[PDB]
Amino acid sequence: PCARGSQPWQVSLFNGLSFHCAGVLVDQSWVLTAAHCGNKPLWARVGDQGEQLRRTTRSVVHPKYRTDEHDLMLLKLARPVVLGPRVRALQLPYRCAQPGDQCQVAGWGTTANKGLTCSSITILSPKECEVFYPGVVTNNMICAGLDRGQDPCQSDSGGPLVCDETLQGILSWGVYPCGSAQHPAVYTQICKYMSWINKVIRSN
Numbered sequence: 001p002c003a004r005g006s007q008p009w010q011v012s013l014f015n016g017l018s019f020h021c022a023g024v025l026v027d028q029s030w031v032l033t034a035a036h037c038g039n040k041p042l043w044a045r046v047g048d049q050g051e052q053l054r055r056t057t058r059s060v061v062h063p064k065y066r067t068d069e070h071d072l073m074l075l076k077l078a079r080p081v082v083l084g085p086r087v088r089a090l091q092l093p094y095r096c097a098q099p100g101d102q103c104q105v106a107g108w109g110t111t112a113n114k115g116l117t118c119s120s121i122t123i124l125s126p127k128e129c130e131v132f133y134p135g136v137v138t139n140n141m142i143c144a145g146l147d148r149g150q151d152p153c154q155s156d157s158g159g160p161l162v163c164d165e166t167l168q169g170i171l172s173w174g175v176y177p178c179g180s181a182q183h184p185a186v187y188t189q190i191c192k193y194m195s196w197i198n199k200v201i202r203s204n
């Protein structure tokens with residue numbers, strides 16, 4: 001799946017020589033990922049050796065960061081990306097995606113060489129995720145239903161949820177157990193964080 005050249009904003013984050021999290025390129029100098037990936041230090045391979053390698057300097061965890069709540073972290077790249085056909089930022093949400101929308105998640109298969117697979121996903125409502133996770137606070141989350149027969153563990157951690165070539169979410173938890181699509185994952189709802197994201201990026 002996942003046609004070649006799509007997902008130019010896909011980012012793999014490494015600690016040491018080891019894989020850690022995925023992330024999105026939201027600016028030529030900025031990558032966004034889950035705060036729970038902030039063990040640190042990290043470095044970012046961008047684009048879909050490696051097309052462009054960079055490392056991070058500033059790592060801004062959301063101030064408001066049971067599961068991780070408000071887990072969002074902005075990684076600053078040492079040197080800016082050169083925006084190509086190959087590597088581009090992902091447009092940030094100007095709007096919130098509603099339950100029922102068809103979205104997409106691309107993943108390399110960590111949490112189970114390389115290569116990206118695309119799976120379509122259905123926004124569920126912050127209601128029937130309380131069924132799978134009774135006691136969850138949603139409000140700032142979107143639960144993404146994966147279609148049956150799909151292995152949830154093909155996503156990564158920090159990976160993007162794209163809807164209509166917008167970034168609506170960063171994967172927080174809800175991937176395990178592998179082997180069943182029946183449970184939805186839990187993404188940070190990114191259209192609720194725009195005030196903060198634009199402020200640390202200084203992108204206004």
Ligand SMILES: [Zn+2]
Nearest residue numbers: 036068071172
């Ligand atoms: Zn987390």
